[PDB]
Design a protein around this ligand. Structure first.
Ligand SMILES: *[C@@H]1O[C@H](CO)[C@@H](O[C@@H]2O[C@H](CO)[C@@H](O[C@@H]3O[C@H](CO[C@H]4O[C@H](CO)[C@@H](O)[C@H](O)[C@@H]4O)[C@@H](O)[C@H](O[C@H]4O[C@H](CO)[C@@H](O)[C@H](O)[C@@H]4O)[C@@H]3O)[C@H](O)[C@H]2NC(C)=O)[C@H](O)[C@H]1NC(C)=O
Ligand SMILES: *[C@@H]1O[C@H](CO)[C@@H](O[C@@H]2O[C@H](CO)[C@@H](O[C@@H]3O[C@H](CO[C@H]4O[C@H](CO)[C@@H](O)[C@H](O)[C@@H]4O)[C@@H](O)[C@H](O[C@H]4O[C@H](CO)[C@@H](O)[C@H](O)[C@@H]4O)[C@@H]3O)[C@H](O)[C@H]2NC(C)=O)[C@H](O)[C@H]1NC(C)=O
Ligand SMILES: *[C@@H]1O[C@H](CO)[C@@H](O[C@@H]2O[C@H](CO)[C@@H](O[C@@H]3O[C@H](CO)[C@@H](O)[C@H](O)[C@@H]3O)[C@H](O)[C@H]2NC(C)=O)[C@H](O)[C@H]1NC(C)=O
Ligand SMILES: *[C@@H]1O[C@H](CO)[C@@H](O[C@@H]2O[C@H](CO)[C@@H](O[C@@H]3O[C@H](CO)[C@@H](O)[C@H](O)[C@@H]3O)[C@H](O)[C@H]2NC(C)=O)[C@H](O)[C@H]1NC(C)=O
Ligand SMILES: *[C@@H]1O[C@H](CO)[C@@H](O[C@@H]2O[C@H](CO)[C@@H](O)[C@H](O)[C@H]2NC(C)=O)[C@H](O)[C@H]1NC(C)=O
Ligand SMILES: *[C@@H]1O[C@H](CO)[C@@H](O[C@@H]2O[C@H](CO)[C@@H](O)[C@H](O)[C@H]2NC(C)=O)[C@H](O)[C@H]1NC(C)=O
Lengths: 642, 642
């Protein structure tokens, strides 16, 4: 049914441009630099410990022909080499500023970082006054403010893009950026940074080092998500006033000292993972409020990695308000869940109809899909990539799955989704490396195996119809692929080395899908769909977090070029509030399957706290809270550190 | 000069026996079971998280024909599968008892472990009363006493080899064995085991659970090396009376709370690694005494992994009293050191003469050899195996090296040694997997690369002359190799899967080197050598730790079959004591290069402690202590927990 297009092999072979770099010692990196420019950097990095100094000139290449023809520019990288952990630090989006943190063969004063500002078309060298411990970090408000960490725990900042390097503090553990060039960092005061792990001091500077202000003492670490600011004392504190107020988080249970973990922090609320007594590897997800202080139960049996803390929690970026994670069950098996109201109510993933298990083993109960993510990756399962979802391409999600078999754990297979996670379908066999470009118009996949591959699998209709193309007759060992950074982008680049019967030489392939996408998608090529509605009312067919939006979708076998935004509703319409448009309240949880939020097995009734006590005004109510960000009206009536 | 033997390709091809297992889902394991029997087990294991229960029948194969012909015995492993972390637990040496810790597809009561006692020729099934968290541990005094850890932190013991399973304690964190069926284990008392990490209680039972005795409280963890017993409070305690006395270790420096790490514990002394202030990744090695209480400085700049604690410390098992580790230097480069008096005096590795750097770059100072070990492996360097040394084959050490270049860090190359580490020589290019058999008479190596290999490299004269053999025309992706477990053993087994243009099917190759080793090594094929002497006196040419022993060595191009012990001195002769026959004393260190132990920069003079104070009798002396185990006489005159 998927058919084909105007015989595509000729159009791809004309657009598949190969360049060979021959012998390149070390691991080869590759990255595009901006769109509508055709600049590709090829840097060789060495996995060398940071403490040791040694010789070696890392090679560097640059193509200004959209990857059609490269040019050796190692002349710049003379007597210098870049480590693998360092790599290439690419500027954010249209900044076009790349820095290469290198080290001299025998240099001792500091590293020789190479800076460019015109999308890596020409560089300017400079010598750091220190040996950098971490790669340069960018500032959000301006890309010309650089953060660095010295080997002697020295914090340096650059106001003029590597020009001047002033030091901020000499006893800095870790440091991050904040809203509008705000720099947060912890500080030790006795020998080693890691020696004072149980008690540090978190500072903050609003003027890039000139004004300091101690914001927190006796701390494990700190974080920064959304508009929030966190600090771990175990105990945890949430801050909104940039650290001026650290009201502790209050939770229903936590009998002893349950360990906490911030899953993800939206600009509205923040997810937190709290463990269970006796470890055992499961916990519960707590959903906060508009301030991130009071938390409500959201999900049980939440699996996490016992050694690390990673979990299958995934933010479906395609659809707003959809998240996916894996949990245990009554039969102690692996099952993944999904929510459509941002942690309000979770539900089981409906098994894919066009997949092979409902007819394979119906007598056996367990064969639900398991979307692999960071929990499976942390457990060293054969999972190359986490679920992928681009916000421009709404609904589109691609990930690795499993059907509750030991073979599917070793071989996950690749699943697709256009409903934003509500419905799935197995499309590819085995592990793959996939990428999304053209705002979902193209989805390229590459097989992950021990055998040298030479085939690329792509789909031009949002993963509905997959085509197979052999980009070369010399099978390469896959090293990686890169996408051109554009909303309308259509070139990609695959690179790897060939087995040439000794003397393995590298080679990069750059493919352009323009001649494939001849036709422009007319209105005859689209279909209109609505997000899944967990509400039974007919006048609420897609009110994700309050409002209803209509989206469009390329039809099957669509080999055309899209240029429209996948959301057709310019100004969305607000629906009346629903039961799923409301989050559970404190001390209340929504049991499995059912949709009515009931009381947690308690009767005494509590009333939170506020850091050093000073409790609430006691709001009883039932167990429903307006979801932070859910814009609806009517429908259902609701009831420390110095 | 190395020549060849009576055209060996025919003798190997007749002894190279191949068997194909076809499609085997999961990772394939293989292991011999005793010598002079020809039993090989081939088990497929799955890398599945322990918490989840799922379906799957793991396949099992057994060959009773020395690997010439296998036989499918999956009939036993019915509705059961073995995880990768579990694998096959092989009995110690001539016990011939193998257990396969499996799990039922839907079983919940406990695992179905399969036990055998006649070298895996026939098994007996049994159902565990619990889900095992760890693989069975063997007891030293008797192989029929099994230790296990339940998923609910339950400690179980088996008196009759899986027959009866009695529980010992319900709140057990970790547990190990001890001298004569003694079981040591820590215990928690508040919710989780890991929640009470700062304070546990270490118990001990001498009668397999009937009599308990609390031996230590407020503990991080515990260890057991040699005849010693350790407990971490940071602080560390050393015990000899099986835990009845925990006299704290005293060290010269340690200004604040330097972190400690026990490197290796001999039956005489014990090495300890103590970190430096500010981390930075280097520390000092401390050598203890005959009791392991008072420690002396031994080496500076000792590199360790900052995230984990691994270090290049290696026990050269071939020569008694030789150890190797890597340290920093004045030029902040990587250099490995070696001692011949068991931590008494370290010296730089003399650069290999027949290697390419002394003529490549003499103007540049740094190009010493760097023997890779656990420090490089922990840093994820391309190092497959640590240094290998079998005690039967004296002098023989094989390891991966480096010459202080970024390329040599990515590609280590394989170095050999017959002087026990004093002299080295590069023999093979690139990373390899190597093994030793025939008590050093055969040394097999296999190339480690991304390309499917079909060539085996071996040497029949203690790594002096290497030969190359192509064991098949179907290149396989190397999975692993196994050696027959015998002092006179001569079969090996290599297994892996072939790229068959999809449907990769497995295949195992078993090679016998008997027809290669026709001749028996007469006295015309040996040479006599003595261990390196760090002493200038001529009448002490090889007095390692006191006594002098004469060893023998197969000459170059020796293609014969040895049957003699490589140490010819039946009763060794005691040398008079030397300066290297004495260890530095407390508060004294031996500086670099020179051999005179001098004072640590201190003048006040201290006098140790004894747990709750009660200090010493103040023995001043200079800075020399008799090495624990060094048997010499004359020559040089020398001067907590409840
Ligand atoms: C799952 O993934 C989705 C992505 O689809 C995430 O949603 C994104 O959330 C981020 C924020 O977390 C959005 O990014 C930007 O947030 C800015 C907030 O910064 C302001 O903070 C304080 C608030 O008082 C201000 O005082 C301060 O001055 C900062 O300005 C917004 O300001 C941004 O708005 C921007 O929009 C226009 C668009 O062109 C810009 O030009 C403006 O300059 C303006 O700054 C923006 O909202 C991001 O937009 C969200 N994505 C989408 C698609 O909505 C979810 O957060 C994530 N889930 C979780 C749990 O993390
Ligand atoms: C570097 O590597 C070398 C290996 O070459 C290590 O040397 C080995 O050390 C181990 C011990 O650590 C030796 O193994 C055995 O140790 C036993 C000690 O157990 C006794 O402990 C107390 C002591 O009072 C006794 O009361 C108790 O009852 C135990 O018996 C010895 O007893 C062993 O002797 C055995 O020898 C014969 C040989 O046939 C046996 O049949 C006997 O049953 C007897 O038990 C043995 O010594 C091992 O032998 C050492 N190897 C060599 C080649 O000497 C180094 O320790 C290691 N370096 C470091 C730092 O760990
Ligand atoms: C995918 O790759 C192709 C080529 O590999 C890119 O097409 C190239 O786009 C550039 C930019 O427009 C073209 O250069 C232009 O040439 C004209 C005429 O010489 C000149 O007037 C412009 O100033 C500009 O230099 C280039 O000719 C063109 N090459 C081909 C073969 O079409 C394409 O842009 C890439 N895809 C994306 C999304 O960028
Ligand atoms: C390396 O492998 C070879 C074969 O792959 C092993 O040789 C085999 O050794 C066994 C044990 O002695 C021999 O079996 C014996 O056969 C005789 C006569 O039938 C019988 O009387 C004995 O009771 C015993 O069963 C077997 O014939 C022999 N095979 C060959 C081809 O020689 C060899 O032992 C292996 N190496 C080592 C070190 O074990
Ligand atoms: C760049 O590379 C060149 C050659 O590879 C280096 O030039 C040599 O430098 C040394 C000492 O720096 C001089 O003694 C030689 O005379 C130079 N060669 C020539 C032909 O003049 C140069 O050092 C490298 N750049 C840096 C910064 O080290
Ligand atoms: C061993 O394997 C056999 C077949 O693969 C299993 O036999 C079946 O068991 C189920 C329930 O246990 C019965 O309903 C079937 O009738 C059995 N098959 C036949 C042909 O009789 C057997 O269960 C497996 N062993 C275990 C312990 O599960």
């Amino acid at each position: 049914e998927c058919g084909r297009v105007r015989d595509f092999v000729a159009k791809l072979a004309n657009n598949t441009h190969q360049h060979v770099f021959d012998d390149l010692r070390g691991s080869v990196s590759l990255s595009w630099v901006g769109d509508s420019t055709g600049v590709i950097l090829v840097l060789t990095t060495f996995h060398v410990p940071l403490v040791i100094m040694t010789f070696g000139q890392s090679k560097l290449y640059r193509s200004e022909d959209y990857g059609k023809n490269f040019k050796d520019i190692t002349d710049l990288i003379n007597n210098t080499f870049i480590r693998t952990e360092f790599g290439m630090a690419i500027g954010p989006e249209n900044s076009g500023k790349v820095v290469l943190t290198a080290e001299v063969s025998g240099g001792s004063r500091g590293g020789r970082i190479f800076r460019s500002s015109d999308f890596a078309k020409n560089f300017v060298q400079t010598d750091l006054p220190f040996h950098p411990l971490t790669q340069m970090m960018y500032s959000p408000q301006n890309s010309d403010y650089l953060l660095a960490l010295s080997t002697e725990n020295g914090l340096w900042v650059s106001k003029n893009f590597g020009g001047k390097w002033e030091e901020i503090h000499k006893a800095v553990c870790l440091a991050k950026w904040g809203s509008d060039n705000t720099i947060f960092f912890t500080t030790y005061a006795n020998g080693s940074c890691k020696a004072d792990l149980g008690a540090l001091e978190l500072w903050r500077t609003s003027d890039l080092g000139k004004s300091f202000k101690t914001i927190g003492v006796k701390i494990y670490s700190f974080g920064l998500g959304g508009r929030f600011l966190f600090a771990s004392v175990r105990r945890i504190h949430v801050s909104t006033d940039q650290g001026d107020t650290w009201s502790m988080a209050q939770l229903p249970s936590v009998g002893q000292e349950q360990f906490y973990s911030i899953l993800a922090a939206n600009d509205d609320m923040v997810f937190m993972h709290v463990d269970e007594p006796g470890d055992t590897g499961f916990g519960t997800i707590f959903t906060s409020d508009d301030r991130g202080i009071v938390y409500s139960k959201s999900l049980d049996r939440h699996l996490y990695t016992t050694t690390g803390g990673e979990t299958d929690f995934t933010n479906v970026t395609s659809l707003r308000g959809v998240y996916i994670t894996s949990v245990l069950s009554e039969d102690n098996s692996i099952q993944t869940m999904i929510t459509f109201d941002q942690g309000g109510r979770w539900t089981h993933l409906r098994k894919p109809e066009n997949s092979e298990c409902d007819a394979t083993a119906k007598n056996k109960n367990e064969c639900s899909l398991h979307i692999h993510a960071s929990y499976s990756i942390s457990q060293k399962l054969n999972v190359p990539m986490a679920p992928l979802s681009e916000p421009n391409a709404v609904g589109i999600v691609i990930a690795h799955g499993s059907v509750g078999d030991a073979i599917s754990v070793m071989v996950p297979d690749v699943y697709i989704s256009d409903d934003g996670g509500y419905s799935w379908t197995k499309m590819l066999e085995g592990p793959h490396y996939y990428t999304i470009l053209d705002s979902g118009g193209i989805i390229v996949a590459i097989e992950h195996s021990s055998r040298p591959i030479n085939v690329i699998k792509f789909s031009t209709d949002e993963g509905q119809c997959w085509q197979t193309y052999t980009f070369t007759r010399d099978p390469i060992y896959f090293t990686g692929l890169a996408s051109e950074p554009g909303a309308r982008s259509m070139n990609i680049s695959i690179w790897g080395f060939t087995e040439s019967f000794l003397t393995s030489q590298w080679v990069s392939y750059t493919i352009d899908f323009k001649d494939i996408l001849e036709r422009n998608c007319e209105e005859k090529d689209y279909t209109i769909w609505l997000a899944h509605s967990t509400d039974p009312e007919d006048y609420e067919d897609g009110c994700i977090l309050g409002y209803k939006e209509q989206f469009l979708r390329l039809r099957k076998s669509s080999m055309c070029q899209n240029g429209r935004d996948y959301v057709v509703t310019k100004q969305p319409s607000i629906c009346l509030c629903s039961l799923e448009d409301f989050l559970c309240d404190f001390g209340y949880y929504r049991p499995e399957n059912d949709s009515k939020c009931v009381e947690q097995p308690e009767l005494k009734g509590h009333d939170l706290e506020f850091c050093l006590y000073g409790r609430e005004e006691h709001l009883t109510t039932n167990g429903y809270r307006k979801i932070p960000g859910d814009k609806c009206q009517g429908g259902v009536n609701p009831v420390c550190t110095s």
